[PDB]
Amino acid sequence: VDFTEGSVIGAMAANDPSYGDSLHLKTMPGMVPFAGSDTQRSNAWSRNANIYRGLYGGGSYIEGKTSSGQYVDVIRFSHWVKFRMEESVFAYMKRRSDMGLSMKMSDEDLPVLKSVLMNNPINIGIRNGGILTGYDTENKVSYDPTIIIPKRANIPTNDLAARILRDVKVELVYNNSLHYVKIRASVVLDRP
Amino acid sequence: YQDKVVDVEVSLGTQPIDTVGFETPMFLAMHGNFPERIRFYVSTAGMVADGFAVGSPAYQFATNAFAGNFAPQRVAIGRMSIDSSKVDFTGTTNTEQVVVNITLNKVVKAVKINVLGNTPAQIATALADAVTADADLTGKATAVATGTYVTVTAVSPNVVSVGKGAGVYKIVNESSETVATVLPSVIAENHNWYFLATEARSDADIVAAAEFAKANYKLHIYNSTDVDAYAPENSAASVFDTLKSLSYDSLGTSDAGADVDFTEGSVIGAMAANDPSYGDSLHLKTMPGMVPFAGSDTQRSNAWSRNANIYRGLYGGGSYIEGKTSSGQYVDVIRFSHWVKFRMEESVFAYMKRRSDMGLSMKMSDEDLPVLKSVLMNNPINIGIRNGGILTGYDTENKVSYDPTIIIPKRANIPTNDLAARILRDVKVELVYNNSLHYVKIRASVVLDRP
Amino acid sequence: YQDKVVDVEVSLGTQPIDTVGFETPMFLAMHGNFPERIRFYVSTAGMVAD
Amino acid sequence: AAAEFAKANYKLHIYNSTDVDAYAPENSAASVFDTLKSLSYDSLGTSDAGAD
Amino acid sequence: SDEDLPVLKSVLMNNPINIGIRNGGILTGYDTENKVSYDPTIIIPKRANIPTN
Amino acid sequence: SDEDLPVLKSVLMNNPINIGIRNGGILTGYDTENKVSYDPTIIIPKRANIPTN
């Protein structure tokens, strides 16, 4: 009747993927709160059919799940990172090549790619909170992004002849937003 | 491509949120004055407008509730279908003008009977004759005398309300419904009340009310004239014993006028306007409208054994004794627990929603989870501490700490599947309630010298 | 599946417990003044009433 | 329609109504006010007798 | 706001309380020997202490 | 609570004890030579010392 599809888009369209902001509780002007019993709300959730439910008077979305089960924001972030690594690397190569001085496959020049990737996608994600970072002192786990680039001596000779580098690897830790909370309280009269 | 030289986003994180209020009581009366199931009133003058007869059960409850020191801002009245009103003189003795107030279609009249020594049957017959001989009641109401009581019925669609005047007697109303079958509709229509009181006086009506009140986070209050309330220690026959055996949480008291004045309102009027954050017990608060308990020492112990609270006179004045539910715990503890539960839930949800309305949603990282600590420390816990409800401080001598403690896990400790589902579980909190003082004992001594 | 955005449990560890008291004596007299088997008094004026 | 247009184009909508249902019991959910609240639109409304 | 809530103190200090004090209805003054204070006191919270809701 | 129980000390010090001292019924003062104290003493336990029941 109203094609509320627009309402769903209107809540996340202008929010850049770098934030990783889920659709959990964002209000959706134009949509009517779901009316149904408890059983229906579980039946719909079982099929990943998202539901707009009213809470504390107001109307709030419930969750963003695709048909495959993964949250929408993860998919959006993956597309964003893929495209803006591709574009960044290609643009850097072209801009160097337009001044002579082309990129050269030597130990003294390959590490430059690390700065380029650390700039643009990864740093933008970190500053906006999309990508987790930091080191835990107690559990001794590291969350910082890591980039691996081989040295010239490790590249097979035929790859040097064809001028093709393959084995670049990267790792990221996405920052999951919070959806549900459970609390345990207690009341006591004294303490040993 | 872009279409604006300058673009500005604006997001408002000021969304209000619905909240629960622990003030407004309810009284579930029998009548047909209004069609809906609940009505709210701010004074008895409003009730008299709708056609409630002066001295009627609802009017008595409202007056007692409003007369208190901490009277609630406004009270709510239920509705059950009325069938007939029963006026009982059984076991009573009268010597002066007996007066009964009858209100019909917003018309007020007072029936007067001149009692000489007349037996109850004579008074009942005279009242029936007087009612039947009234010009404005023929064809609208009917009264039939029998035994020691007179039954009054309204000819539909007329509305009749009966209330007390001078004299010794009681009003009993029948109904084609029952509290158990009526309560769900009332709560369905409007859920803005916390104290539940009922006009139905007999046993099962109280048991069902207590069960429903416990199920839906409401506090049940009732009074009873059962002489068995203070029977010997082995009676195990009054309503109080049955409620205690079931471990239900209801507040009960033994009073003589509970079937005449419905003093339930008086009990509510002493704590209704006092916020739960104070944890102020009902021990010594005076209760206008209640008559001090009259009985021997044995009866005062028998009643206390069953958790049937007693209103006792002391040093001339009248003071309540203690607030104990049927389960043995003090009422203020229950009220405080409900308050803290609801205003932690609301606070956390409101914070999450307000953050989520500006993007920047809450994220499960070590640099953002501790924020929950500030939110909980604000609102419930700090409000409790400032008002004295929650104990705080550190003892230097015994080296015990009384401050509230909050525990929140780090990201590395959360299981991976919980991260995938985005669900945090193991938050824990501890509080030390501040017990008020009920009894004191002192040892004095007189000496002539000291080594 | 879960049905609440926030859920809170509250438990009360303030349950009182019955206790014995080593004060009140008993005197087992012979009479028929009252029907029950025991009566408590706080003064002789109460006894004279019965 | 006026409320939707006002929200779309950064205008503030103001209206009055004599609907007796505006203050019906808590479960009426039949007046214009209920419909507007359900849609989360931003309009200012008031109940008055002379609005018509 | 913290810069405007304290105004309520002046309003209450005027009208009821001051009228009572001047007419003798309300006690006031400080005792030097026993060090007890009889003056009226008014408490108003700051903005930071009010719960967000 | 530890911050409110000591109030009982002021109440008892007022009314009976102080009235007795002022009227001479109750002895008071400290002897410098024999080092004996005659002042009334009041003892009140702290919360931590009260049994839980």
Short mmCIF file of N, CA, C and O in Angstrom, two decimals, chain B residues 292-346:
data_model
loop_
_atom_site.label_atom_id
_atom_site.label_comp_id
_atom_site.label_asym_id
_atom_site.label_seq_id
_atom_site.Cartn_x
_atom_site.Cartn_y
_atom_site.Cartn_z
N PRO B 292 -7.88 1.81 67.17
CA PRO B 292 -6.86 0.97 67.80
C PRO B 292 -7.39 -0.41 68.16
O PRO B 292 -8.54 -0.57 68.57
N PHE B 293 -6.53 -1.41 67.99
CA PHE B 293 -6.90 -2.78 68.31
C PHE B 293 -7.20 -2.91 69.79
O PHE B 293 -6.47 -2.37 70.63
N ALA B 294 -8.28 -3.63 70.12
CA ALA B 294 -8.66 -3.90 71.50
C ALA B 294 -8.59 -5.40 71.74
O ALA B 294 -9.34 -6.17 71.12
N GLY B 295 -7.71 -5.82 72.63
CA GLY B 295 -7.55 -7.24 72.91
C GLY B 295 -6.51 -7.46 73.98
O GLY B 295 -5.74 -6.55 74.33
N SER B 296 -6.48 -8.69 74.49
CA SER B 296 -5.55 -9.06 75.54
C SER B 296 -4.15 -9.25 74.97
O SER B 296 -3.91 -9.14 73.77
N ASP B 297 -3.20 -9.54 75.86
CA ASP B 297 -1.82 -9.76 75.43
C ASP B 297 -1.72 -11.00 74.56
O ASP B 297 -0.97 -11.02 73.58
N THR B 298 -2.47 -12.05 74.90
CA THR B 298 -2.40 -13.29 74.13
C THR B 298 -2.83 -13.06 72.68
O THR B 298 -2.25 -13.63 71.76
N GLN B 299 -3.87 -12.25 72.48
CA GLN B 299 -4.36 -12.01 71.13
C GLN B 299 -3.33 -11.27 70.28
O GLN B 299 -3.18 -11.56 69.09
N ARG B 300 -2.63 -10.30 70.88
CA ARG B 300 -1.60 -9.57 70.15
C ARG B 300 -0.45 -10.47 69.71
O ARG B 300 0.18 -10.17 68.69
N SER B 301 -0.17 -11.54 70.44
CA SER B 301 0.85 -12.49 70.03
C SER B 301 0.31 -13.47 68.99
O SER B 301 1.00 -13.79 68.02
N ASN B 302 -0.92 -13.93 69.18
CA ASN B 302 -1.54 -14.81 68.20
C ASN B 302 -1.60 -14.16 66.83
O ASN B 302 -1.27 -14.80 65.83
N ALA B 303 -2.01 -12.89 66.76
CA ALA B 303 -2.06 -12.19 65.49
C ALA B 303 -0.67 -12.01 64.88
O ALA B 303 -0.51 -12.13 63.67
N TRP B 304 0.33 -11.72 65.71
CA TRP B 304 1.68 -11.52 65.19
C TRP B 304 2.27 -12.82 64.67
O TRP B 304 3.12 -12.80 63.77
N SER B 305 1.84 -13.95 65.21
CA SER B 305 2.38 -15.23 64.76
C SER B 305 2.01 -15.52 63.31
O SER B 305 2.77 -16.19 62.60
N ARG B 306 0.85 -15.04 62.86
CA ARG B 306 0.37 -15.29 61.51
C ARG B 306 0.73 -14.19 60.52
O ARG B 306 0.24 -14.20 59.39
N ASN B 307 1.55 -13.22 60.93
CA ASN B 307 1.88 -12.07 60.10
C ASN B 307 0.65 -11.22 59.80
O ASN B 307 0.60 -10.52 58.79
N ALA B 308 -0.36 -11.28 60.66
CA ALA B 308 -1.53 -10.42 60.55
C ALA B 308 -1.23 -9.13 61.31
O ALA B 308 -1.33 -9.08 62.53
N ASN B 309 -0.88 -8.08 60.58
CA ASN B 309 -0.44 -6.85 61.21
C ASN B 309 -1.57 -6.25 62.04
O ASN B 309 -2.76 -6.43 61.75
N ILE B 310 -1.19 -5.54 63.10
CA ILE B 310 -2.12 -5.03 64.09
C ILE B 310 -1.86 -3.54 64.29
O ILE B 310 -0.70 -3.10 64.32
N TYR B 311 -2.93 -2.77 64.44
CA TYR B 311 -2.85 -1.35 64.74
C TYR B 311 -3.12 -1.15 66.22
O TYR B 311 -4.25 -1.33 66.68
N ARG B 312 -2.09 -0.77 66.97
CA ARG B 312 -2.14 -0.72 68.42
C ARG B 312 -1.95 0.71 68.92
O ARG B 312 -1.17 1.47 68.34
N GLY B 313 -2.66 1.05 69.99
CA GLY B 313 -2.48 2.36 70.60
C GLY B 313 -1.32 2.36 71.58
O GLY B 313 -1.08 1.39 72.29
N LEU B 314 -0.59 3.47 71.60
CA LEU B 314 0.57 3.61 72.47
C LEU B 314 0.68 5.06 72.92
O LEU B 314 0.60 5.97 72.09
N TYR B 315 0.86 5.26 74.22
CA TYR B 315 1.01 6.60 74.79
C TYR B 315 -0.12 7.52 74.32
O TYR B 315 0.10 8.67 73.95
N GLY B 316 -1.34 6.99 74.33
CA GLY B 316 -2.50 7.77 73.94
C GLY B 316 -2.77 7.71 72.45
O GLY B 316 -3.91 7.45 72.03
N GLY B 317 -1.75 7.95 71.64
CA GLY B 317 -1.92 7.93 70.20
C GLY B 317 -2.01 6.53 69.65
O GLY B 317 -1.75 5.53 70.32
N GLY B 318 -2.40 6.45 68.38
CA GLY B 318 -2.53 5.19 67.66
C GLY B 318 -1.43 5.06 66.63
O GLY B 318 -1.24 5.94 65.79
N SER B 319 -0.70 3.95 66.71
CA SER B 319 0.43 3.69 65.83
C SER B 319 0.34 2.29 65.26
O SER B 319 -0.02 1.34 65.95
N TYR B 320 0.69 2.17 63.98
CA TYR B 320 0.81 0.87 63.33
C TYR B 320 1.91 0.10 64.05
O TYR B 320 2.59 0.68 64.90
N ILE B 321 2.10 -1.18 63.75
CA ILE B 321 3.07 -1.97 64.50
C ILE B 321 4.23 -2.39 63.61
O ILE B 321 5.39 -2.14 63.94
N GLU B 322 3.94 -3.01 62.47
CA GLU B 322 4.98 -3.53 61.60
C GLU B 322 4.38 -3.81 60.23
O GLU B 322 3.17 -4.05 60.10
N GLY B 323 5.22 -3.76 59.21
CA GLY B 323 4.81 -4.16 57.88
C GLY B 323 5.42 -5.48 57.48
O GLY B 323 6.59 -5.53 57.10
N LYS B 324 4.64 -6.56 57.55
CA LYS B 324 5.08 -7.88 57.11
C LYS B 324 4.10 -8.44 56.11
O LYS B 324 2.88 -8.42 56.34
N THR B 325 4.62 -8.94 54.99
CA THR B 325 3.80 -9.63 54.02
C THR B 325 3.48 -11.04 54.50
O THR B 325 3.92 -11.48 55.57
N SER B 326 2.70 -11.76 53.70
CA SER B 326 2.35 -13.13 54.07
C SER B 326 3.56 -14.04 54.05
O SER B 326 3.58 -15.07 54.73
N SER B 327 4.59 -13.70 53.27
CA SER B 327 5.78 -14.52 53.17
C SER B 327 6.80 -14.23 54.26
O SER B 327 7.78 -14.96 54.37
N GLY B 328 6.58 -13.20 55.07
CA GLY B 328 7.46 -12.87 56.16
C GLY B 328 8.40 -11.70 55.91
O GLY B 328 8.95 -11.16 56.87
N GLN B 329 8.58 -11.30 54.66
CA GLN B 329 9.48 -10.18 54.37
C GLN B 329 8.74 -8.86 54.50
O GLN B 329 7.53 -8.77 54.28
N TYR B 330 9.49 -7.82 54.85
CA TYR B 330 8.90 -6.50 55.06
C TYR B 330 8.47 -5.90 53.72
O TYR B 330 9.13 -6.11 52.70
N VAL B 331 7.38 -5.14 53.74
CA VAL B 331 6.79 -4.64 52.50
C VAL B 331 7.76 -3.71 51.78
O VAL B 331 7.91 -3.78 50.55
N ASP B 332 8.42 -2.83 52.52
CA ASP B 332 9.31 -1.86 51.89
C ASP B 332 10.41 -2.53 51.08
O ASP B 332 10.81 -1.98 50.05
N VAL B 333 10.89 -3.70 51.50
CA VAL B 333 11.90 -4.41 50.71
C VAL B 333 11.32 -4.79 49.35
O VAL B 333 11.98 -4.64 48.32
N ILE B 334 10.09 -5.29 49.34
CA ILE B 334 9.46 -5.68 48.08
C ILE B 334 9.30 -4.47 47.17
O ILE B 334 9.60 -4.51 45.97
N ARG B 335 8.82 -3.37 47.75
CA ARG B 335 8.64 -2.16 46.95
C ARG B 335 9.96 -1.68 46.37
O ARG B 335 10.04 -1.33 45.19
N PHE B 336 11.02 -1.70 47.18
CA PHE B 336 12.33 -1.28 46.71
C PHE B 336 12.84 -2.19 45.60
O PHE B 336 13.45 -1.72 44.63
N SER B 337 12.62 -3.50 45.73
CA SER B 337 13.08 -4.42 44.70
C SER B 337 12.38 -4.14 43.37
O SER B 337 13.03 -4.08 42.32
N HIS B 338 11.06 -3.95 43.41
CA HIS B 338 10.36 -3.63 42.17
C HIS B 338 10.89 -2.33 41.57
O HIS B 338 11.14 -2.25 40.35
N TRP B 339 11.07 -1.31 42.40
CA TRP B 339 11.55 -0.02 41.92
C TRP B 339 12.90 -0.17 41.23
O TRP B 339 13.10 0.32 40.11
N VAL B 340 13.85 -0.83 41.89
CA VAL B 340 15.19 -0.94 41.32
C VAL B 340 15.16 -1.75 40.03
O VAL B 340 15.81 -1.37 39.05
N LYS B 341 14.42 -2.85 40.00
CA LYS B 341 14.35 -3.64 38.77
C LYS B 341 13.86 -2.79 37.61
O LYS B 341 14.52 -2.69 36.56
N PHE B 342 12.71 -2.13 37.79
CA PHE B 342 12.12 -1.40 36.68
C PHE B 342 12.97 -0.22 36.24
O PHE B 342 13.09 0.03 35.04
N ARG B 343 13.58 0.52 37.17
CA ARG B 343 14.36 1.68 36.78
C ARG B 343 15.82 1.38 36.50
O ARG B 343 16.59 2.31 36.24
N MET B 344 16.24 0.11 36.56
CA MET B 344 17.44 -0.26 35.81
C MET B 344 17.08 -0.63 34.38
O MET B 344 17.76 -0.21 33.43
N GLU B 345 16.01 -1.42 34.22
CA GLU B 345 15.59 -1.80 32.87
C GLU B 345 15.36 -0.58 32.00
O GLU B 345 15.93 -0.46 30.90
N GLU B 346 14.54 0.36 32.48
CA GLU B 346 14.19 1.52 31.68
C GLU B 346 15.41 2.36 31.36
O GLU B 346 15.58 2.83 30.23
#
